[PDB]
Design a protein around this ligand. Structure first.
Ligand SMILES: [Mg+2]
Ligand SMILES: [Mg+2]
Ligand SMILES: [Zn+2]
Lengths: 46, 124, 98, 147, 201, 245
RNA sequence: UAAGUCGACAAGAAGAUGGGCUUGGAAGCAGCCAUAAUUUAAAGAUCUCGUAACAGAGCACUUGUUAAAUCUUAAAAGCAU
């Protein structure tokens, strides 16, 4: 995982999602990829 | 005479067979008509150019009639019906297929560029 | 649609009959190598005079012999029925591997 | 699955060697049986001539191959009468856009498009368009075409 | 949703029962939204769900079909639950009729699985326990939830069965959590044809 | 300069975009449905380029053997086994049948000089054709009685067509023996005389092409009727026998 | 955008040809030069992986199936993260 303020897709298999959002926190924007795990990124800090 | 190679010439190295002689050219009259048209597919100085040609191309405009200066829409972007009529005769059918094929070559030429351009944008 | 678990097929339809749309379409999903792999295929054309009950006979490699109705069922209904049996044949063959 | 191999070899010079040895000796076919049949299907050709071969190795390693006419490039160069170069083979222009190694009249193009149509897989292609394809290759191997 | 519009074909033997809108009083909420209780019964068993009331079901008996619709397509909440409620029903129907199955493949030297009983830790009478030897100092034992049937055709293969898919795949993931597939040799537990790309060496 | 109201003469207003392959095909299959008097509708099932080229190699060989001392133009070079876009090829059949260009009231269009000149929009991609096809297709049972209604069931799935500039049974019989042989009427070519026909690539393709029907002089036909038309020795000869009576 | 948009799925994605040079090898895919043609429903002398080099898997592109009757894609702007 790489934490950036500017998360970008690096291939056609990367997807933008917002996870860990619940009734207590807003969550983070993620770049998830089933092809290359080196594309995994998170926007925002805990 | 139109041929640079007269009859009887020996074509170097075109007989890979054992019990044979290298091909020998024949008279130009026997040769098919299409052969002599095959080569249709072969497609300071700027100051002098922009000095005379610019002056020559000016009067070439002759903007008294604008219709001749139309955008010249390509054949792949028109909407006019193609030359096809019911029971119009074999000649109309033959001359119709030639235009249907004439349009295919245009869409082809445009597809090639779209493919080349797409590849360029992808390896930039 | 999966075709690995198919070995034989037989089709009879009248082309001018709108009910045969599923039969003419069923052969659309068979791959090119089907004839060479060993799948036996057979299709017959009925005269336009009048349509006879179209018969789309299927047979897997396990001995199952399906005989589906082409008129009342659509291509979508005929594809999933072949997906069901072709799936258990893979899971059974998956757990039986080794 | 049935594999296929591309290998250019001499007319009757089939034998376990750089060309044939590592090309087919790797897949497990009877390399000696191949060189014995190829030499029988290529006797009417001049010894040493190049001949493209497409050998389809079926499962169980039972191969069947089909020899093909020599490359059009090898024919255009032999027709243009280009100067021999490295390895004792006629070489083409290293800069086709500028350099010009030879000139072939359109009569040569007619001849080079008829021994290529001799094939059974190319016997249907009209000879008209088949003569404009070699002209499209001459521009690539640095050869001019005279009417 | 292009899925919610799709009618649901009720196969023979399956029976869908739709209740009337009801609200259970909650002392912590001032207003509970009504819901409908849908019961899908058949040969293998029975399943129940509570759907929102804005989802309308036109159950056709003589035709054996049931299409879902919402009261307002322009509401985000109604669009979402339209396809979700349709997907859950499609699983309920196909689970009570045929049943859902999951296959676990154990890859590795010494990985085995056996189905036996543990009367000392059984949560209910006759509970089966899947015992796994996964290279750990201790044995791994997991009890199958009530409503599932586990088996082992081979020592290195497990087969789960049940009418609830969410319960089946959740249990398969509970077993896979002990040995997650590794990329260097492929050792681990694979669920339903799961594969993993290997590495260079 | 050119004004805004002006529209080019070779690009009149059409129902939908013009440069798209969806419309350039509709403009093509309409002319193809008008000129070509005789066509057979095939069904192709996942062939490869090598198989396609092999099938098209036998046609060329089988169509080049027919004798043409009639002085008429060479027709062999204009017969083609073409794959079509079935979704659009079905629209082109309605347009050719329902649309009537005579029901268009002309309108004056402004040229580059701004002068209003009468111009009637009759092309097949016109909104008048798009409108007449839909309104005429509303009725369903009335369509089954037309020529389009009798052919729509064939234009389902992937299909190819073999066109012929003229109704020459001598040319069709040579093509039917290569694509849909029914011996002894249309016997396939011999093995001693045509070894190419019985090759792995060629033979592996003909098993995927299934002739389904035809269309002759704006009339639908079946695999049984095509045989009879092909059975005609000669058009003029068929007329002479009628006169001998 | 029912002339079926969008997505998925199925199959196809040719031939001259292994373009010429370079190189131990360079076959679409180290590098250099060229990149008018040809035939097709379409197919870059080649966009991404892969091979020592071939082979092989995808893309551009092509047809078919499923399927939307206010439901495609993009840009700008406002307020938010
Ligand atoms: Mg190269
Ligand atoms: Mg490389
Ligand atoms: Zn990625």
């Amino acid at each position: 995982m790489k934490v950036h303020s500017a998360i970008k897709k690096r291939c056609e298999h990367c997807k933008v999602v917002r996870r860990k959002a619940n009734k207590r926190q807003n969550g983070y924007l993620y770049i998830i990829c089933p092809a290359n795990p080196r594309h995994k990124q998170r926007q925002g800090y805990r | 005479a139109i041929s640079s190679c007269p009859a009887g010439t020996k074509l170097n190295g075109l007989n890979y067979f054992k019990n044979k002689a290298d091909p020998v050219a024949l008279p130009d009259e026997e040769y098919p008509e299409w052969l002599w048209r095959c080569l249709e597919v072969q497609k300071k100085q700027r100051r002098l150019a922009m000095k005379r040609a610019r002056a020559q191309e000016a009067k070439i405009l002759a903007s008294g009639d604008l219709e001749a200066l139309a955008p010249k829409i390509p054949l792949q972007k028109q909407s006019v019906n193609l030359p096809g009529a019911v029971n119009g005769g074999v000649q109309d059918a033959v001359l119709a297929d030639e235009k249907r094929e004439e349009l295919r070559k245009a869409m082809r030429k445009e597809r090639k560029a779209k493919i080349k351009e797409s590849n360029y944008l992808k390896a930039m | 649609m999966l075709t690995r678990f198919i070995t034989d097929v037989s089709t009879r339809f009248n082309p001018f009959s709108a009910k045969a749309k599923a039969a003419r379409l069923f052969l659309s999903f068979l791959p090119p190598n089907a004839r060479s792999n060993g799948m036996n295929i057979t299709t017959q054309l009925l005269p336009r005079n009048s349509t006879e009950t179209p018969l789309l006979y299927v047979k897997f490699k396990d001995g199952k012999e399906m005989n589906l109705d082409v008129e009342n069922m659509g291509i979508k209904s005929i594809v999933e029925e072949v997906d069901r049996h072709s799936r258990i044949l893979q899971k059974q063959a998956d757990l039986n591997d080794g | 699955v049935e594999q296929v191999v591309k290998l250019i070899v001499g007319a009757g010079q089939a034998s376990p060697s750089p060309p044939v040895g590592p090309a087919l000796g790797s897949k497990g076919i009877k390399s000696m049986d191949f060189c014995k049949e190829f030499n029988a299907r290529t006797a009417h050709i001049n010894t040493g001539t190049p001949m493209p071969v497409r050998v389809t190795v079926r499962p169980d390693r039972s191969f069947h191959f089909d020899v093909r006419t020599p490359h059009t490039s090898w024919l255009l160069l032999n027709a243009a009468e280009a100067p021999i170069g490295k390895g004792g083979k006629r070489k083409g222009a290293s800069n086709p856009g500028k350099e010009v190694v030879g000139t072939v009249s359109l009569k040569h193009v007619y001849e080079i498009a008829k021994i290529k149509q001799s094939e059974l897989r190319l016997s249907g292609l009209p000879l008209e368009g088949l003569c404009r394809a070699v002209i499209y290759q001459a521009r690539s191997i640095g050869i001019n075409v005279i009417p | 949703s292009k899925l919610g519009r799709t009618p649901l074909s009720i196969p023979p033997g399956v029976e869908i029962t739709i209740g009337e809108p009801f609200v259970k009083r909650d002392m912590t909420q001032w207003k509970q939204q009504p819901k409908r209780k849908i019961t899908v019964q058949g040969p293998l068993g029975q399943l129940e769900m509570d759907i929102p009331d804005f989802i309308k079901i036109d159950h056709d008996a003589e035709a054996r079909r049931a299409t879902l619709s919402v009261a307002n397509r322009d509401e985000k909440e109604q669009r979402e639950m339209w396809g979700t409620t349709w997907a859950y029903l499609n699983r309920f129907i196909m689970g009570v009729s045929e049943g859902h199955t999951a296959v676990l493949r154990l890859v590795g030297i010494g990985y085995r699985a056996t189905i036996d009983t543990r009367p000392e830790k059984e949560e209910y009478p006759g509970q089966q326990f899947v015992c796994l030897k996964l290279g750990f100092s201790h044995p791994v034992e997991m009890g199958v939830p009530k409503g599932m049937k586990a088996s082992t055709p081979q020592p290195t293969r497990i087969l789960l069965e049940g009418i609830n898919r969410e319960q089946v795949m959740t249990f398969a993931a509970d077993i896979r959590r002990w040995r997650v597939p590794e990329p260097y040799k492929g050792k681990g537990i694979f669920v339903n044809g799961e594969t993993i790309k290997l590495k260079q060496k | 300069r050119l004004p805004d109201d002006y529209v080019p003469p070779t690009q009149p207003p059409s129902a939908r975009p013009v440069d798209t392959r969806k419309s350039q095909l509709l403009r093509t299959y309409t002319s193809m449905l008008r000129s070509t008097p005789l066509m057979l509708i095939f069904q192709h099932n996942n062939l490869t380029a090598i198989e396609w080229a092999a099938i098209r190699r036998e046609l060329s060989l089988a169509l080049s053997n027919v004798p043409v001392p009639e002085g008429a133009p060479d027709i062999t070079s204009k017969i083609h086994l073409q794959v079509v876009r079935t979704r659009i090829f079905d629209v082109a059949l309605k347009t050719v049948e329902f649309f009537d260009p005579s029901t268009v009231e002309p309108t004056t269009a402004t040229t580059a000089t701004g002068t209003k000149v009468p111009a009637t929009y009759n092309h097949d991609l016109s909104k008048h054709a798009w409108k007449a096809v839909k309104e005429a297709t509303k009725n369903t049972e009335a369509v089954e009685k037309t020529v389009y209604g009798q052919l729509a069931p064939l234009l389902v799935g992937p299909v190819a067509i073999l066109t012929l500039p003229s109704v020459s049974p001598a040319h069709l019989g040579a093509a039917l023996s290569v694509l849909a042989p029914s011996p002894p009427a249309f016997p396939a070519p011999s093995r001693k005389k045509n070894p190419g026909y019985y090759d792995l690539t060629c033979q592996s393709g003909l098993q995927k092409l299934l002739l389904v029907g035809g269309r002759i002089e704006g009339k639908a036909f079946d695999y049984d009727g095509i045989k009879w038309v092909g059975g005609i020795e000669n058009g003029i000869e068929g007329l002479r026998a009628q006169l001998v009576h």
